[PDB]
Amino acid sequence: STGSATTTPIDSLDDAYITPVQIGTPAQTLNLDFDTGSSDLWVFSSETTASEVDGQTIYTPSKSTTAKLLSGATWSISYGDGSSSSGDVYTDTVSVGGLTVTGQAVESAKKVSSSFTEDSTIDGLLGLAFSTLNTVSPTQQKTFFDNAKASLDSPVFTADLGYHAPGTYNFGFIDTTAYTGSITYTAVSTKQGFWEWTSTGYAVGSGTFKSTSIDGIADTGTTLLYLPATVVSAYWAQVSGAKSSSSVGGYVFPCSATLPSFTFGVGSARIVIPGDYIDFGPISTGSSSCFGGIQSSAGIGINIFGDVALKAAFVVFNGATTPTLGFASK
8 A cells, every 4th residue: 555645844944844644444634644653643623722722623532333442541741842742542543644554553632732732733743763662651652754654555654745835744765756766765763762873974055075984863853953153163163253152052144144055965976955054044933033943962862853854855664574765866
């Protein structure tokens, strides 16, 4: 089997991407944030505290003839951005772009933190990291991909995120028309539960490539590109007027600037992030100071190849017995 679904930016900045997901019988379609940095499929629901729901579409398990309460199971998660959510668990039928899993754990939110409430466009998350990170207790549950894997034509999914435009998540096959040149595969460590890999270096604009190992994770659920302070300093030094602002919480730059591209290495291959991808607009409405899309990972504890990086590539998440990551230009 295979599946294919369109993923759409939630706003004009590509702050995140939503993908329609069918849950239950009859189908209830929710728009979920596909997140290769976490491993819980959780949704706004009929059980979510009413004051914490503000425009989201909810899953109502009582209206699904295939929903079954997973007795005694709870979940609770906290994300890198400080947000969180928690609740109980159902199993139900879940379909993504034509691909169907029966008995998928659907984590129903009883509580969500304010940032989720405040975002009307995201109805929940669909985690695609390794199932070892799943937070369901006392019996850990598998991700949608993990459940689907055996049935897929090939044990892979691909992320093809758009810049200010729709893109595609495919399950079970590689669309060879969706990228240019070749896919370069690179090793993955699953030891922390992430799609963790090592970039071979970087360049700033038309500058010379610096060969240096950068360990980080491929994370569709993170907006920006978080890299070591040395790398980030080298990038923003090429932008007149750019500075790190403690009050804003990262590098800012004059909105009148033209940003240089940023290249990262995948083995001997190179992925080029156009400068425009690195502009995340005014820090506040009407400001002429703009927020940068490349930021320091210092104090995160890990480098993160988030959407800014991933949307410059066609990315293969290869879930073979030994997982690997593939990157192609597009």
